[PDB]
Write a protein that holds these residues in place. Structure first.
Motif, PDB file in Angstrom:
ATOM      1  N   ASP A 107       0.883  -1.146   0.000  1.00 16.84           N
ATOM      2  CA  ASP A 107       0.000   0.000   0.000  1.00 16.84           C
ATOM      3  C   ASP A 107       0.926   1.201   0.000  1.00 16.84           C
ATOM      4  N   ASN A 108       1.146   1.773  -1.179  1.00 24.47           N
ATOM      5  CA  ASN A 108       2.020   2.938  -1.369  1.00 24.47           C
ATOM      6  C   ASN A 108       1.296   4.209  -0.981  1.00 24.47           C
ATOM      7  N   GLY A 109       0.211   4.063  -0.229  1.00 21.15           N
ATOM      8  CA  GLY A 109      -0.557   5.221   0.184  1.00 21.15           C
ATOM      9  C   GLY A 109      -1.624   5.610  -0.827  1.00 21.15           C
ATOM     10  N   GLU A 110      -1.261   5.566  -2.103  1.00 20.27           N
ATOM     11  CA  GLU A 110      -2.225   5.900  -3.133  1.00 20.27           C
ATOM     12  C   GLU A 110      -3.255   4.767  -3.361  1.00 20.27           C
ATOM     13  N   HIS A 111      -2.803   3.509  -3.403  1.00 16.28           N
ATOM     14  CA  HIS A 111      -3.686   2.358  -3.621  1.00 16.28           C
ATOM     15  C   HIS A 111      -2.924   1.085  -3.366  1.00 16.28           C
ATOM     16  N   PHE A 112      -3.628  -0.030  -3.306  1.00  9.94           N
ATOM     17  CA  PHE A 112      -2.946  -1.296  -3.087  1.00  9.94           C
ATOM     18  C   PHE A 112      -2.287  -1.738  -4.397  1.00  9.94           C
ATOM     19  N   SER A 113      -1.095  -2.329  -4.311  1.00 11.43           N
ATOM     20  CA  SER A 113      -0.403  -2.844  -5.500  1.00 11.43           C
ATOM     21  C   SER A 113       0.177  -4.200  -5.176  1.00 11.43           C
ATOM     22  N   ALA A 114       0.235  -5.083  -6.170  1.00 10.10           N
ATOM     23  CA  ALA A 114       0.773  -6.410  -5.927  1.00 10.10           C
ATOM     24  C   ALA A 114       1.794  -6.808  -6.953  1.00 10.10           C
ATOM     25  N   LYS A 115       2.659  -7.719  -6.548  1.00  9.48           N
ATOM     26  CA  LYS A 115       3.580  -8.336  -7.448  1.00  9.48           C
ATOM     27  C   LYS A 115       2.775  -9.622  -7.521  1.00  9.48           C
ATOM     28  N   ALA A 116       2.393 -10.032  -8.721  1.00 12.89           N
ATOM     29  CA  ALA A 116       1.562 -11.225  -8.851  1.00 12.89           C
ATOM     30  C   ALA A 116       2.063 -12.209  -9.891  1.00 12.89           C
ATOM     31  N   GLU A 117       1.563 -13.430  -9.796  1.00 21.23           N
ATOM     32  CA  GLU A 117       1.946 -14.493 -10.704  1.00 21.23           C
ATOM     33  C   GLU A 117       0.698 -15.211 -11.195  1.00 21.23           C
ATOM     34  N   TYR A 118       0.521 -15.339 -12.517  1.00 16.63           N
ATOM     35  CA  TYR A 118      -0.669 -16.046 -13.029  1.00 16.63           C
ATOM     36  C   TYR A 118      -0.627 -17.499 -12.662  1.00 16.63           C
ATOM     37  N   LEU A 119      -1.798 -18.081 -12.412  1.00 17.97           N
ATOM     38  CA  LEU A 119      -1.918 -19.482 -12.055  1.00 17.97           C
ATOM     39  C   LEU A 119      -2.504 -20.256 -13.249  1.00 17.97           C
TER      40      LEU A 119
END
Lengths: 108, 110, 108, 110, 110, 109, 110, 110
Positions: free
Chosen positions: E98-110
């Motif tokens: 949560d960079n303060g502006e919005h939630f962000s993820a490092k993600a991996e497709y399944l």
């Protein structure tokens, strides 16, 4: 003085040679730090092995200084590192700068 | 095609014929060992991918691991458990789950 | 004081767990002798050599006392024994009491 | 099919993927390690039979082994050697010979 | 692996192939949508662990979700945004922030 | 003359003829659902504005909504509910209240 | 592996987790629904291959589709039917048949 | 009234504000979509009755449907199209005309 790598599944002692798998960025950062120096790293077990993101309070203060013999980055970015335990040491000032754990050690 | 408990590993890759002492100190993992101890003493060892949770979930493990047998399980005075294992053969898991007690999966010996 | 198992190919240290294969009857007797007592044996490296087998003067002085976790006779008669190193010891006196090697050790 | 130096192992059995520090104290075996070093660092680890001595003959060795890579080799002043090996793959020996300097085998990977 | 804005969902669950109109009225979630519209118009939809709060923190979110493409986005005069999304594929979150502006993820497709 | 229990919604606007499973984890909202079940199975779906508190008040709700019928309600093990609804008709809310149990609205059909 | 009535769908594709109100105006399809109701309410939803009429034959149906649950069913005044279904999981069908009354098949959950 | 292309649907009744993926394989129905695209992208969605002819006559089509907007048209590998539509407003069709290319209708909003 020396990068610190937390180990949960195995306990490495002097003279043991073991291939380790390191898939967490911070820990990889830690290995690279040692390479950028003299290939020595401090192996410590976790007091509470319950979290894979330990803080300085979750690490033991005695461990095994080991030398990195071989390191290879796989396709996905994960690392296979071969280490050899050299001798026991006590940690004196566990620090965490964000990049990886580090400390001052005193060989035992 | 078998149903077997799953022990996630973070620091080592155990291959068939390796014999190694593992230290486990997490409730669900400890229950995983005991689950296997009850049956044929065999457990599935699988590496974990980096996750943002303290412990990995069912979506955070690789798909191929090594089925191993528990040669010795010994509780230690500090609260952890030293478990000596022997790798028997590789297997791929197909339907991993967490039933509260421990992870379990369907594995196909490769 | 403790039965002695000479090893030519590996130097086992405290905390190491490893399967050993023993095909010499004398060595097999050594193992039995430990199983009759507390299941501990002293693992000692063989020095550089040319003879067919070691004698009381052909082993190193410091070895590793280990416990026998399990044994199993293979079809060919060779014995497979899983061992775990506990701690180092210095050999005070090493004798070949006819049946297997034995030594007065001193824990280090 | 390959031709490779053979190192007899009495105390341990090494399989593919196992990394292990071995100790060598006999000159013929030292020469075998060197022969590998003068080529591709590949050496074939072969178990010794039942009650063979430390001076095995070709008939005292198994007919299968583990081809391994020499990761590190250190010759101590005392005439003894410490060699770190990694098992790569098993192989079948069709012909084992002693060519005066050390054992050698024509073998095929399994 | 991708880096992608994370939109939490409380009232409904969105899976691959589902096309659905979502109403977004909280500033943080609106910034999440605006960030996706500056990247490649994809957002990762995740359920909340705590359904009682409308201000989840990073620990209140599941770490598996549906990566969805924004097909249409329209900013209404009542301060809300109507966004049409199509679920594409499930994915796991390796890192949630949560960079303060919005939630962000490092993600991996399944 | 009739008060309809109000279910505040955050992520979707349900229109007539639409059918959708909603997940409700707030106790007050479940009480609203329970009240509809003891009467009509009818509820008023209303969008919520971003409130300053995490517990919205009548002033945090739009004044228009969708009257819907609860087709099925399943209580989940964690205590939360999955309720399948069908939108029936949009309507302006003439009065919105909180009878200490759940929100309620007088609809302008 | 079960035997289940097969309802062909031309205009939409229902996936697991979707809940969708369907319109069923053809007699044969109504019988299909009624048969699923006489059992455990489960029904196999299958798509139609390109260039198939509204009177498909068994070669006009895909063989992998979605097993769904009939949530509610209503026959209107004109004999036409409104049915609400929920997709549960993919199944592959074998032995697709048509006794004249409605399609039926043996299916295996994917 | 307005002139607008007509797309007969068999399996679902689309209402205003609904967004849904429709699969269209009939050439004539695809021409129906293409005509809409060459104008304002509006098509009249109307349910059809079971008729003896698979090419509905005015009496085989309900008179009330929904004018929808085409949000996206995607070609599929089998020669068919998947079209994303959004229902806009109900309309009554008073005339059906087959301009040899696709159905067309005079329609009255609401």
């Amino acid at each position: 003085e020396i990068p610190v790598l937390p180990l949960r599944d195995v306990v490495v002692y002097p003279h043991m040679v073991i291939p380790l798998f390191v898939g967490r960025e911070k820990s990889i950062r830690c290995l690279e730090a040692a390479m950028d120096h003299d290939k020595k790293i401090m192996l410590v077990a976790q007091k509470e092995a319950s979290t894979d993101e330990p803080g300085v309070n979750d690490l033991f203060t005695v461990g095994t200084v080991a030398s990195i013999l071989q390191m290879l980055k796989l396709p996905d970015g994960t690392v296979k590192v071969l280490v050899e335990g050299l001798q026991r040491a006590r940690i004196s000032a566990l620090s965490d700068n964000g990049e990886h754990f580090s400390a001052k050690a005193e060989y035992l």
